[PDB]
């Protein structure tokens, strides 16, 4: 993309055409790797409306 320098994540790194989700607390994007999440799991989570939250928002 034009921001590769452009941060996200719990691992501040850039996206890296990596598959990512986004919390639905903060709004932040997070690769599913980092948070433990397959394209598959989101996909369901997604389709199911399952409001996933990040590492952080989670505990709140
Ligand atoms: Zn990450
Ligand atoms: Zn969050």
Same mark, same amino acid.
Do not use: S
């Given at each position: 993309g034009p921001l590769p320098n452009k941060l996200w994540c719990i691992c501040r790194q850039?996206? =890296? =055409?990596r598959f990512m989700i986004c919390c639905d607390l903060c709004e932040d994007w997070f690769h599913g790797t980092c948070v433990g999440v397959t394209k598959a799991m989101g996909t369901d989570m997604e389709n199911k409306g399952i409001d996933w939250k990040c590492p952080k928002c989670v505990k709140r």
């Open positions: 850039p996206h =890296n =055409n």
